[PDB]
């Protein structure tokens, strides 16, 4: 049903809210929820661990069967699988992990995957323990994504800093 509410409108197609992406998926019932994935789809930590636990491990079981036959994703790449009880589909997107020396330039490629979907509920790619500058990830999102993206950022201090810096 894609019933998003309580978002700040940053541009004509990018919205942001201080919220847990899991609670937003349960309220909104989106067509697509984006996972902040890694190349072997190991759903531990951050967004991935929270989405997988909210599916009672159904996401991990499906992802392990996908990887057994198809192998790992590339950094900047994505994979549509089931959204289970959270969404119709889950778009698993791998942003670069700059704390592990991956190329920050691939963050644009990671957000370009969003353009295949009319509307998405998504996290801020490559933030948290992946190490990218959040203000930079928000600018790449705004400059790259043309479809409707609703960003859920589960940290009030980070949310306030992003909004204040975007509005300068
Ligand atoms: C930057 C941060 C704030 C962001 N995290 C998040 N952004 C949006 N919704 C989120 N939910 C959770 C979460 C975790 N646990 N729970 C359950 C819970 O707290 N319960 C009490 C039941 C919910 C984290 C989260 C982020 C974004 C991208 C990343 C990244 C992290 O980790 C590495 C890859 O990429």
Curated annotation (Swiss-Prot):
Catalytic activity annotated for this protein? Thiol-dependent hydrolysis of ester, thioester, amide, peptide and isopeptide bonds formed by the C-terminal Gly of ubiquitin (a 76-residue protein attached to proteins as an intracellular targeting signal)
Species assigned in the record: Severe acute respiratory syndrome coronavirus 2
Assembly with partners or alone: May form homohexamers. Interacts with N protein.
Relate the protein's function as given in its record.
Responsible for the cleavages located at the N-terminus of the replicase polyprotein. Participates together with nsp4 in the assembly of virally-induced cytoplasmic double-membrane vesicles necessary for viral replication. Antagonizes innate immune induction of type I interferon by blocking the phosphorylation, dimerization and subsequent nuclear translocation of host IRF3. Also prevents host NF-kappa-B signaling. In addition, PL-PRO possesses a deubiquitinating/deISGylating activity and processes both 'Lys-48'- and 'Lys-63'-linked polyubiquitin chains from cellular substrates.
Q: How is its activity regulated?
A: Inhibited in vitro by GRL-0617.
Q: Which domain of life is it from?
A: Viruses
* Name of the encoding gene: rep
UniProt protein name: Papain-like protease nsp3
Q: Where does the record place the Macro domain? A: 1-168
The annotated topology with respect to the bilayer is: Multi-pass membrane protein
Please state where this protein is localized: Host endoplasmic reticulum membrane
């Amino acid at each position: 049903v894609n019933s998003f509410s309580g978002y700040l409108k940053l541009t004509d197609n990018v919205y942001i809210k201080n919220a847990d992406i899991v609670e937003e998926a349960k309220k909104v019932k989106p067509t697509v929820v984006v996972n902040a994935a890694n190349v072997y789809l190991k759903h531990g930590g951050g967004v991935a661990g929270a989405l997988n636990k909210a599916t009672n491990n159904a996401m991990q079981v499906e992802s392990d069967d996908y990887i057994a036959t198809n192998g790992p994703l590339k950094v900047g790449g994505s994979c549509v699988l089931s959204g289970h009880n959270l969404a119709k589909h889950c778009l698993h997107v791998v942003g670069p992990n700059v704390n592990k020396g991956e190329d920050i330039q691939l963050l644009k490629s990671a957000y370009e995957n969003f353009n295949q979907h009319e509307v998405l509920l998504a996290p801020l790619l490559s933030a948290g323990i992946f190490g990218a500058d959040p203000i930079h990830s928000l600018r790449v999102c705004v400059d790259t994504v043309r479809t409707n993206v609703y960003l859920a950022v589960f940290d009030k201090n980070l949310y306030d800093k992003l909004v204040s810096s975007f509005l300068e």
